[PDB]
Design a protein around this ligand. Structure first.
Ligand SMILES: CN[C@@H]1[C@@H](O)[C@@H](O[C@@H]2[C@@H](O)[C@H](O[C@H]3O[C@H]([C@@H](C)O)[C@@H](O)[C@H](O)[C@H]3N)[C@@H](N)C[C@H]2N)OC[C@]1(C)O
Ligand SMILES: CN[C@@H]1[C@@H](O)[C@@H](O[C@@H]2[C@@H](O)[C@H](O[C@H]3O[C@H]([C@@H](C)O)[C@@H](O)[C@H](O)[C@H]3N)[C@@H](N)C[C@H]2N)OC[C@]1(C)O
Ligand SMILES: CN[C@@H]1[C@@H](O)[C@@H](O[C@@H]2[C@@H](O)[C@H](O[C@H]3O[C@H]([C@@H](C)O)[C@@H](O)[C@H](O)[C@H]3N)[C@@H](N)C[C@H]2N)OC[C@]1(C)O
Ligand SMILES: CN[C@@H]1[C@@H](O)[C@@H](O[C@@H]2[C@@H](O)[C@H](O[C@H]3O[C@H]([C@@H](C)O)[C@@H](O)[C@H](O)[C@H]3N)[C@@H](N)C[C@H]2N)OC[C@]1(C)O
Ligand SMILES: CN[C@@H]1[C@@H](O)[C@@H](O[C@@H]2[C@@H](O)[C@H](O[C@H]3O[C@H]([C@@H](C)O)[C@@H](O)[C@H](O)[C@H]3N)[C@@H](N)C[C@H]2N)OC[C@]1(C)O
Lengths: 185, 148, 155
RNA sequence: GCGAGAGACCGAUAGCGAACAAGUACAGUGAUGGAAAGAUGAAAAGAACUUUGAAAAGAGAGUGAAAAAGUACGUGAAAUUGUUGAAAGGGAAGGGCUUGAGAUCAGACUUGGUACCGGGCCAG
RNA sequence: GCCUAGACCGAGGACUGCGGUUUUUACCUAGGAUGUUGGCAUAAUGAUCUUAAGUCGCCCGUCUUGAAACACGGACCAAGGAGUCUAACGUCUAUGCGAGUGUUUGGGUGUAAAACCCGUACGCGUAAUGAAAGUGAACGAAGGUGGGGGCCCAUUAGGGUGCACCAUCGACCGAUCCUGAUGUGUUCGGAUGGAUUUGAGUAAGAGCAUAGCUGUUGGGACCCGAAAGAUGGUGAACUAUGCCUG
RNA sequence: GGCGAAAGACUAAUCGAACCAUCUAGUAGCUGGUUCCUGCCGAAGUUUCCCUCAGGAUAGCAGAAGCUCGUAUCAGUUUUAU
RNA sequence: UUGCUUAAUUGAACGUGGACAAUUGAAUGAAGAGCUUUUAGUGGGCCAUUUUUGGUAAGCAGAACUGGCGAUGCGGGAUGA
RNA sequence: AGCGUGCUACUUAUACUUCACCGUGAUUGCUGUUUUGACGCUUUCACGAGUAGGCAGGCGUGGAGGUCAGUGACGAAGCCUUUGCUGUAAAGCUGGGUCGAACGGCCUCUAGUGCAGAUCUUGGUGGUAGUAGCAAAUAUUCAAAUGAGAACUUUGAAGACUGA
């Protein structure tokens, strides 16, 4: 017998491979597994774990967020790295000349990057031209902007969005939401 | 497909995952939204506040077309300019020749004031406009023209 | 049926280098050459023989003598023998040339073996008669009588 | 209703109740209720003839690729039953573990190498 | 320190290590068993079946605090036999495209219910808030402070830049309360500045579509089960009562 | 509905409301059942509300999926102080 | 810094700049810490030591802390949750 | 061989120690030798009870797309069998017998997909068991004929009964 101090046979709870069956994603995973195993550069381990992430854990990165990342002091010449899709933003007034490494580019994002003389490259090309991730800047998208996140943790006085199918005066604005109808939580 | 369901895995186990004590029965607790004020109050008052009662005035024979007025913000306004001539218009527009943007013809009813415009004069045609939206258009040398 | 793959090679690996260097047996302190023995097993179980020599294959060289017992020059294993207290001086017995290959495998007995049996038994019988009743003791078989306790017995 | 073409459908306890002389046989005063039941063989070639028996049948014979296909008919499971052989048995039987006994199965003298070399198994 | 009696085990499979003896780039008991001998291969050896012996072993399923129960179902066997499909949804995951997205109502076309092609609308998303009339999102590098992986400069320590995410103080939009300029259809307008208030908001978009498991609601709704209630019909060949004729 | 010298009797072995088909797979907080193997984790009979007391919702306890990080600050325990 | 506070240059709260660096200010431990979504069953309990109420009492009824049984075989108490 | 007490040895749990093997969780390393398996190989350590329940990896069934230019009248499928083999297991393969027309492996798709129970449904079959029983209504007998066969048919002869 053992007086166990912790729960037995616990899986780590972190994803160790992509759930995706895409062969080319698995080729990228192979490359960065070698890189993380043989280089002790933290960038490669970060890139390795990022390739495993699910779709909601890889929010799209807009070119406007990229350009704001490029306006950091000393970051104008960095290689912007997105493990995910780079989308276009028509609210952007101007976009600079930059090198962006991403899994995917939407058509507008790629056109905008190339028109300003930039380079829209894949992650294997990035690995070839920066095997340690030299002069890179990792940009991540907004995880909590998802519509599903509005409804997480709903409860009295929590100020969250109710799960509801129609919006209007007759849909959940009465008793419990109004002091004139009893109480307001 | 049926071969992936837990019904296949529950074969050979007596209760099919429904318990021996509870004994999955027909409608314990009622049907539908039964008892929302009595034995399901603890659910409705927590997750659906506002459910019971009346608020506001009735509107007999509401016609939704009366209220059609899609909004467009200033930061998206230049997407309505012809894409082949957008770059030319930015460099060449002035008080004598400014692009005309027909927001109503593109499916919009009111121009709102979120964001920043290019420092380029524009003639904006709209049914309605917000106060701040017109000020920002007039500040880049443009004008708002009311249409119907 | 699951077909074999290419990576299921049939290479037989070599063994690792074993560190088991064999080193000499140490016999019991009671197995001194010339000691009278009791055979515990085999064709000649119960016979009382004379221990002559320690061969290099760990076995013991014994002789009846063949004229006394009917058991010749042959090998026995030390774990199947009882070493007694009775000792015969065999210091003058010529047992130089008896080795493993002497009892090498090749019924009728080779003439050389008969000659050597005569030669060794000569000196053996010479020394044996010096001890009274020793010859008749060697001629008689050994057995356990009723009430004999081998844990309490001196041999 | 009439005429057609199809199916990731069912395959004789399924599919319509009905694949068959099925809304039949049968029940109820009546309104109504309502089954079971597909397959010898390519071809009856459905066994002439002899013999025992009152006969049904049996035994020979014969036909057939097959009678281990004989209109009790394709295959022909189990419950249950007979005979034969082996075994066991003092108020149940059955089960696990272990070994003995009896029976069965299996293997390296290898795809062995040229009388020797060398190997397999059990043991000191 | 030394001598001495037994038992069980032999995982691994070129070398690589640590030590030891030093006589020496050698040897060792030091990163897990070898040497030798006999017998057998018409066989000891192993496995299963039956049976004997020793020892232990109550009848499963179920409800239950508690079943071997003097609780319930079960004589036996075969075949059938119970979480399904659909509408609309929550989470998660995969995929395509992405400020968009969805060809399939329809049209074109066809090797004809397929595959292939086409677009207007529409749906959902891109803006919220108020009962409503209505109004409607940048003071500032889209702000300040404290953390923050990674990157950069260094040289351990140190400095810089810091996306996601977190705590905190502000700013913007709608509702509410107050203030109330220039002006006027003189009762409208609402500049401007305030308020321990309030919203399912803003603050460099994230969504749409298809599919899958699980969960939800309506449906026969996992399967079998009432006592009842209703609509439309059939019976006085039994029997109850009146009548007519015997 | 009938019929009843009245028993709730009789009305085709059916009567404190016949028989037949249909609505109808009527509803059941109740009883019974609920079909292959191995592996890992693993409860509750407690809180609040309910014409609630053989039932639900709610929290707790459990599983699954992970995600952000990598020794930060944590503990069914002691010590010192209060 | 402030529109708060003081008679005040007094304070309050949050800061700039400078000083203290591994004994960063008790022990022991730490299959690491933190965060989120979603959903099952359950919502009859019972027993033992100690505390304890009603009752003459009860294998009675009702509370407290803990450990158990339920959900669990195994060795022992012959037998037994 | 009782009671109180002290002592020495000894007995044996699924517990403890060391070792083997299985699984689970973690962990070392692996590309100019990564080389046709990197969802792989490999180093090391710890752990293993479980109802209700959750999840994972697998076994089996009907039918569908693809493939094995798969099996088969020189015997498919089914069935019977101390012929054996593999797997912890669900199960898979094989020897012999029976038999007569179709069927299987692999990658996927799909569902009316797995039974010991439901006083389950339909069909079939047992023990009970050659058992309970075949007893109301007065009652039968001899001979002949027929016939393979006569308590039971026919005829004759009797004895009876119903008793208008
Ligand atoms: C001779 N008796 C007749 C006869 O026609 C009988 O036929 C069965 C026949 O149906 C069977 O044949 C059967 O074949 C298969 C299979 C299970 O055998 C059945 O599925 C199928 O229903 C049936 N045709 C046959 N094997 C025996 C005859 N006595 O069916 C009716 C009956 C009155 O019993
Ligand atoms: C900066 N503080 C402001 C506070 O001053 C206030 O602003 C009011 C604003 O509500 C009024 O505006 C109000 O009334 C006008 C109407 C009169 O035209 C409406 O159009 C508007 O929707 C309504 N909010 C505005 N007219 C004056 C501001 N000071 O609004 C709340 C606030 C954000 O806290
Ligand atoms: C008019 N007085 C204001 C006071 O009301 C407050 O302003 C609130 C502001 O804090 C709220 O904002 C709050 O809630 C929003 C959320 C609702 O979107 C958050 O984004 C925000 O971080 C949070 N501070 C904002 N929603 C309304 C203002 N009137 O801020 C202080 C103040 C200036 O005194
Ligand atoms: C980089 N600029 C950021 C700008 O992007 C934005 O950041 C928001 C931040 O304010 C939000 O956070 C805000 O709203 C959340 C919400 C849950 O109520 C609250 O934590 C709180 O009210 C407030 N901090 C955060 N949830 C998302 C960021 N992108 O807000 C302004 C800013 C801080 O300057
Ligand atoms: C000093 N106060 C004591 C308090 O310490 C405690 O004493 C327990 C005593 O009750 C326990 O004893 C108890 O439990 C044992 C057994 C089941 O363990 C029983 O044999 C006994 O009858 C029972 N009284 C004893 N074993 C330990 C003391 N500390 O409870 C009794 C008490 C009087 O309150």
């Amino acid at each position: 017998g053992r007086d166990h101090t912790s729960k037995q046979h616990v899986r780590s709870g972190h994803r160790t491979a992509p759930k995706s069956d895409n062969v080319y994603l698995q080729l990228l995973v192979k490359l960065y597994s070698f890189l993380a195993r043989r280089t002790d550069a933290p960038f490669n381990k970060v890139i390795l774990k990022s390739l495993f992430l699910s779709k909601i854990n890889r929010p799209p990165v807009s070119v406007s967020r990229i350009s704001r990342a490029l306006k950091q002091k000393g970051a104008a010449e960095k290689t912007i790295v997105v493990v995910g899709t780079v989308t276009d933003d028509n609210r952007l007034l101007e976009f600079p000349k930059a090198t962006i490494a991403a899994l995917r580019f939407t058509a507008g994002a790629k056109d905008r990057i190339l028109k300003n003389g930039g380079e829209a490259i894949t992650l294997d090309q990035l690995a070839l031209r920066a095997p340690k991730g030299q002069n890179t800047l990792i940009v991540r998208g907004p995880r909590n902007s998802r519509e599903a996140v509005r409804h997480f943790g709903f409860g009295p006085h929590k100020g969250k969005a109710p799960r509801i199918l129609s919006k209007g005066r007759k849909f959940e604005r009465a008793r419990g939401r109004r002091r004139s109808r009893g109480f307001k939580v | 497909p049926t071969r992936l369901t837990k019904t296949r895995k529950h074969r050979g186990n007596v209760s099919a995952g429904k318990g021996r004590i509870g004994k999955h029965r027909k409608h314990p607790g009622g049907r539908g939204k039964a008892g929302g004020q009595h034995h399901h109050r603890t659910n409705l008052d927590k997750y659906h506040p506002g459910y019971f009662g009346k608020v506001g005035m009735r509107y007999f024979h509401k016609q939704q077309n009366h209220f059609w007025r899609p909004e467009i913000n200033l930061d998206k306004l230049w997407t309505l300019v012809d894409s082949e001539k957008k770059d030319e218009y930015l460099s060449k527009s002035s008080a004598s020749a400014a692009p005309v943007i027909d927001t109503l013809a593109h499916g919009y009813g009111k121009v709102l004031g979120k964001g920043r415009l290019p420092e380029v004069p524009v003639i904006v045609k709209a049914r309605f406009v917000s106060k701040l939206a017109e000020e920002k258009i007039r500040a880049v040398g443009g004008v708002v023209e009311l249409v119907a | 049926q699951v077909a074999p793959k290419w990576y299921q090679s049939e290479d037989v690996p070599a063994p690792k280098q074993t560190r088991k260097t064999a080193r000499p047996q140490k016999l019991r302190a009671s197995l001194v050459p010339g000691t009278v023995l009791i055979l515990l097993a085999g064709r000649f179980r119960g016979k009382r023989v004379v221990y002559l020599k320690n061969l290099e294959d760990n076995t013991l060289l014994v002789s009846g003598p063949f004229k006394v017992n009917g058991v010749p020059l042959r090998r026995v294993n030390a774990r199947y023998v009882i070493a007694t207290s009775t000792k015969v001086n065999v210091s003058g017995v010529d047992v130089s040339k008896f080795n493993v290959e002497y009892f090498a495998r090749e019924k009728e007995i080779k003439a050389e073996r008969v000659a050597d049996q005569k030669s060794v038994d000569a000196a053996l019988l010479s020394e044996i008669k010096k001890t009274p009743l020793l010859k008749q003791y060697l001629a008689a078989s050994f057995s356990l009588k009723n009430g004999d306790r081998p844990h309490l017995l001196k041999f």
